[PDB]
């Protein structure tokens, strides 16, 4: 499942999601589930922060080169924490322990987004289990069930576009029989890999002491026998 992601998202979202997976030592070619989750997360965070703008007087409008939101999720970890340290140190708001997904320059608050498939209030309280009152929240789901924060300022144009996009993604996942891939977990360990090629294997074979034909004979002779006496 990758032509789905190739046709349904722009190249920027896919490259940012692949670099986001590569930062946590993963493989995007072998896990379309987490790649799809990060692509959906970045598309929601970019559609919410698309065309909200504050002018020179500071009044918001949805239609300038100073937007209302600054996107923290998507950037590399050092750059995203640079933006979080700067925006926390400038406005005086205390720096959160974790990495938020958006920043609102009107409310001047860190707005974290979550994406779930069941009760939006359930994932809301799952976030409140670990956050506290340090961030805001914008929880959504695939069945027109959202749960915004208690000090939120989200309008209803983008709230229409986000849920329309989530439902259309769900319909296209179910149309090509792809929701079953997302229900199951694509779990494999990204262990350390080190493949010996052709020349170094030949060199290690001929670099053995006298009495051994190949290297694995010498290795098993070292591992198996008891040289006592």
């Amino acid at each position: 499942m990758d032509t789905f992601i190739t046709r349904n998202f722009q190249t920027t979202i896919i490259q940012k999601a692949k670099n986001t997976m590569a930062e946590f030592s993963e493989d995007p070619e072998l896990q379309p589930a987490m790649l799809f989750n990060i692509c959906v997360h970045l598309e929601v965070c970019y559609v919410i922060s698309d065309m909200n703008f504050l002018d020179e007087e500071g009044k918001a409008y949805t239609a300038n080169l100073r937007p209302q939101y600054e996107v923290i999720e998507g950037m590399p970890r050092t750059i995203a924490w640079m933006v979080q340290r700067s925006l926390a140190q400038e406005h005086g708001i205390e720096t959160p322990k974790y990495l938020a997904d958006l920043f609102d320059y009107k409310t001047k608050r860190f707005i974290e987004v979550g994406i779930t498939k069941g009760l939006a209030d359930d994932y809301f309280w799952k976030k409140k289990e670990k956050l506290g009152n340090s961030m805001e929240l914008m929880i959504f789901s695939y069945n027109q069930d959202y749960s915004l924060s208690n000090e939120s300022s989200l309008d209803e144009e983008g709230k229409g576009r986000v849920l329309s996009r989530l439902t259309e993604l769900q319909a296209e996942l179910s149309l090509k029989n792809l929701w079953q891939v997302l229900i199951g977990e694509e779990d494999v360990e990204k262990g350390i890999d080190f493949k010996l090629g052709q020349t170094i294997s030949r060199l290690r074979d001929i670099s053995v002491p006298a009495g051994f034909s190949n290297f694995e004979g010498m290795r098993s002779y070292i591992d198996n026998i008891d040289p006592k006496g």
Binding site: N19, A22, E23, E56, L65, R66, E70, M75, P76, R77, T78, I79, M82, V83, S86, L87, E90, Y105
Partner: protein, 88 residues
């Protein structure tokens, strides 16, 4: 003022490795801009798999935004800065 440094040995100006002078001073300029944008780069080792131009462009964009949101720039010099960053 007694912590001076001695001059570079100029025997390389006659050999075949004079291009490695220019090849050094192409590097140094880039690094001397990087520590301009990231002042902690001399003390901390910078970590990251992204490019050296992406990090500098993001740092300059955030510096220009937090300059205009504090009065330390104009409404026109901010447009010049964001137009240059739109080129980059």
């Amino acid at each position: 003022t007694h912590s001076w440094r001695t001059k570079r040995n100029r025997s390389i100006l006659n050999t075949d490795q004079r291009n490695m002078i220019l090849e050094e001073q192409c590097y140094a300029k880039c690094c001397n801009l990087f520590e301009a944008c990231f002042n902690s780069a001399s003390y901390r080792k910078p970590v990251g798999q992204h490019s050296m131009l992406e990090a500098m462009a993001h740092r300059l964009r955030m510096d220009a935004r937090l300059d205009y949101e504090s009065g330390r720039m104009s409404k026109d010099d901010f447009e010049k800065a964001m137009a240059h960053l739109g080129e980059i």
